[PDB]
Ligand binder design. Structure first.
Ligand SMILES: [Ca+2]
Ligand SMILES: [Ca+2]
Ligand SMILES: [Ca+2]
Ligand SMILES: [Ca+2]
Ligand SMILES: [Ca+2]
Lengths: 324, 324
């Protein structure tokens, strides 16, 4: 199930078997945010500095941090010594002119190099449509096998992130996609839980768009609480691997309500990958007010944000040590 | 070296008394172009698959193993002599002639795990490498080979790395201009890819000299004395402690055989060969023009004569990899 070194790495990424990972491997996305508050093009120096500030100030309150090798290596070196490190292995984005969204590793990186850079885990993002072109998915499955094999050889945990989509639906925030999301998410988890892919932890979406669930919905309601709850139980039944939720797309408050709903429904999720919901406010402050201002924001609102999340995690998350 | 139990067993299957006498037939596009010279119609998948099966069935009784391609070669792999091991090619063929980078790329729906599952005892990968070339291109190449070596470590299957050298600024590798730098290209690349981080088990390489320019073998211009050519072989032997075998490329069976004798007398302790075209080339024309049974007869006579002479020469020239 786990080797000695994989186990020690998992322990370093976790606290009492729960993963509270701070996500900051954003690259193009972060540049765009920064680009909001200044005229000049955001610089390499600024991106590297902001990542270092967030890492330095908030990793004492996180079990681990996810960074990118492109801008995040300086930040990784100033993380809390008690915090583990995950490094992203994939190139960002996808070709919007096609529907295949094929995976591609960073050109001058390898699992070995990620380990050599001091990571306790390899993170890789895969876009997957279970109902998509079968040859496309065969290529995707082959690619993940390679990465899973690399990680076994280098004896470093493999964190596979799955973002689902539909080749025929442009907007994943649409009601049309919400109706099939549980299917997309849970069936993908079933595929990638197979031993052949070498995954140690799955980083996945919640199997429902909570914005369409009764009580959580501001607008149209597509699902009852009981229907949403069943999707979470179906997800829990879709894998025996540790899995953690990504907070991408929703507010901090909604994500936290979702963790509660997940736990109450019977999901035994083992933590979260949360980023933007925690450090977003530091970006404008850093750009408009500079480095020191960001530190004080991070020591105050930043701590409050991640502290609130941790308190929610305490009463909702299950330790991965109960899956081993 | 060090080997795991399975890697050793696989190596044993590919070898006889520590010597690799491998038949190479992973040609794809190259083989198609050969066939097209003898008929009007485009060569069919059926034809390519059939000729590979004929060569495998008829000649693998006289080889320690056979190298085949996944694309057309799987049926052929299943009719090889039970005493012969199997290598499968992992790389896409060819390179972009409009650029000088010649970047490597694995077959889209394959992985080291899938190659193993297809019954192979080795993963073979061809890398084009110019040691003096663009440093960033070579960084990308080194990262890529690290990934493959790691795969093979995890799947516990020997990694056979084929290196073909070139120069970004020299169009023809058969030129006297390239002959003057070949030893450098070949021997320095071997030093690089003998590093532990690349996970190579056997290197498949060019002889470090173009013998057609060596005194006594040369019809035209003479660039090297025999002592100079001999020194290039000693320099090559001094470039690696890994098992390595010579590819014939590039040359006639007789010249190749004379080259093996010269290599051994010079002090090269090479551990076998990967020989293909020099052995089975004549069967292509026969197969297309006269059909399968005629090709079998060609293979049983001239084909056998080619590989039999080679085997006798190997027997007195090659050194066992088991002394490493
Ligand atoms: Ca721990
Ligand atoms: Ca709430
Ligand atoms: Ca023709
Ligand atoms: Ca040596
Ligand atoms: Ca001998």
């Amino acid at each position: 199930t786990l080797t000695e070194n994989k186990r020690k790495s998992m322990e370093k990424l976790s606290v009492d078997g729960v993963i509270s990972a701070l996500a900051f491997d954003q690259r193009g996305a972060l540049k765009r945010m920064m680009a909001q508050h200044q005229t000049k093009e955001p610089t390499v120096e600024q991106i590297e500095e902001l990542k270092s500030l967030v890492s330095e100030e908030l990793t004492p309150f996180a079990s681990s941090i996810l960074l990118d090798p492109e801008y995040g290596l300086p930040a990784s070196r100033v993380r809390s010594e008690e915090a583990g490190l995950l490094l992203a292995y994939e190139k960002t984005g996808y070709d919007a002119t096609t529907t295949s969204r094929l995976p591609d590793c960073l050109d001058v990186w390898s699992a070995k190099r990620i380990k050599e850079a001091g990571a306790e885990a390899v993170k890789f993002l895969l876009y997957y449509d279970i109902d998509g072109d079968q040859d496309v998915n065969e290529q995707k499955k082959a690619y993940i096998e390679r990465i899973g094999s690399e990680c076994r050889a280098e004896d470093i945990p493999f964190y596979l992130q799955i973002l689902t989509y539909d080749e025929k639906i442009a907007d994943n925030a649409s009601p049309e996609f919400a109706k099939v999301k549980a299917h997309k998410v849970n069936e993908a988890m079933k595929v990638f839980s197979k031993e052949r892919f070498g995954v140690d932890v799955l980083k996945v979406e919640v199997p429902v768009n909570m914005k369409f669930v009764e009580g959580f919905a501001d607008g149209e309601v597509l699902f009852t609480k009981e229907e949403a709850a069943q999707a979470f139980r179906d997800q829990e039944a879709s894998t025996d691997l540790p899995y953690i939720y990504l907070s991408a797309g929703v507010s901090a408050k909604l994500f936290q309500d979702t963790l509660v709903f997940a736990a109450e429904s019977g999901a035994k999720f083992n933590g979260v990958l949360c980023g933007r919901a925690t450090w977003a406010g530091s970006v404008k402050v850093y750009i408009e007010e500079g480095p020191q201002a960001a530190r004080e924001w991070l020591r105050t609102e930043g701590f409050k944000n991640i502290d609130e999340l941790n308190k929610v995690l305490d009463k909702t998350a299950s330790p991965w040590t109960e899956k081993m």
